[PDB]
């Protein structure tokens, strides 16, 4: 057996849910860096 | 508990007797200071008496 706590199925759920959470953190850091061009909305 | 009511009677009668016998010079601070301080002294006495009238916790110590 691989382990009793860190079994064959838990340890490859925590790789899938680490890859997906990595893609999520990257995509949320893309959307967090999204700023509005305010000079093209004002009168000045 | 009736020795709390018996003290409430002699505090309340004293406060009513001071409401009518307050000095006329500064009435709204004679019958406001003295009547409220008797109320708060009786309130802390009643709270410190009823917590020991029927206690749930016994005093427990080792060094004696």
């Amino acid at each position: 057996i691989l382990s009793s706590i860190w079994t064959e199925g838990l340890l490859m759920c925590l790789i899938v849910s680490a890859l997906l959470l990595f893609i999520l953190i990257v995509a949320l850091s893309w959307i967090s860096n999204l700023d509005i061009t305010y000079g093209a909305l004002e009168k000045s | 508990f009736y020795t709390v009511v018996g003290v409430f009677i002699v505090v309340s009668a004293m406060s009513v007797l001071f409401w009518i016998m307050a000095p006329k010079n500064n009435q709204a601070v004679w019958r406001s200071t003295v009547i409220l301080t008797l109320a708060m002294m009786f309130l802390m006495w009643a709270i410190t008496f009823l917590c020991q009238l029927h206690p749930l916790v016994a005093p427990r110590r080792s060094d004696l």
């Binding site: - | 406001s32 802390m44 427990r60």
Partner: protein, 282 residues
Amino acid sequence: AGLATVVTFPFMFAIMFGDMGHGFILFLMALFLVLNERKFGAMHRDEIFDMAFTGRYVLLLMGAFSVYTGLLYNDIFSKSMTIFKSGWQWPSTFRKGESIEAKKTGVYPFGLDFAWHGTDNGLLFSNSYKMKLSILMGYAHMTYSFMFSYINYRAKNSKVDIIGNFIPGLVFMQSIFGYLSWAIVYKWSKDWIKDDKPAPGLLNMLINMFLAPGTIDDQLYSGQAKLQVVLLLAALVCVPWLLLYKPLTLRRLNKFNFGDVMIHQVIHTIEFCLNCISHTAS
């Protein structure tokens, strides 16, 4: 508000500052300024000593109440006073170094008991006493200062403000935290050991009065499960009533901005119903 302050501010001070030793020091350094108020009046006072001498009578009361409450506690430079006869006796024959309990003989006459001083579980009893003391004195201070609102609306001769703010405030405050302050006194009144009944927990009584009405795990009084439903409905009926009485009867007496009254009464209802919980814990 500075005419009820003249007693309550030194007394709410003294509940936090409870000691006959520090209280006598503060009373003495206040009475030094009271007896010498003629030499200090015709004198240039800097800001800190101007603050201390402008209030030479707030500190005299703050010392005089601190002596009273530190005689209620047994706290004279954190020591006890064996003035009266104790309500607890210790066993005469016991082995050295073992944990012993005391048997209750009577009740201590004035103030807290002096057999709680060098005690392992004395701090649990002082926690229970001072927590319930703070709850009852905050309840008393709030229900005393809430009657002044009724006296204000009566002097303004506004029955609309009375029925819209005072009565739905009164039977919301008293139906929850007046019931809590009554339940503390009623638990202190019952014995719960001679009766061989379980002593109810009052935190998860008020938790379960709002979550699961009618279910009483430890019964505190006869008819509890049906009276708490009546008190819960009396408290919940005053959330729409305090929010909807005054704007809908100011609008009816114009048959004035209804948006400036309805939004103000919603903010008043949210603020008051928040503060009834937020101040009894403060």
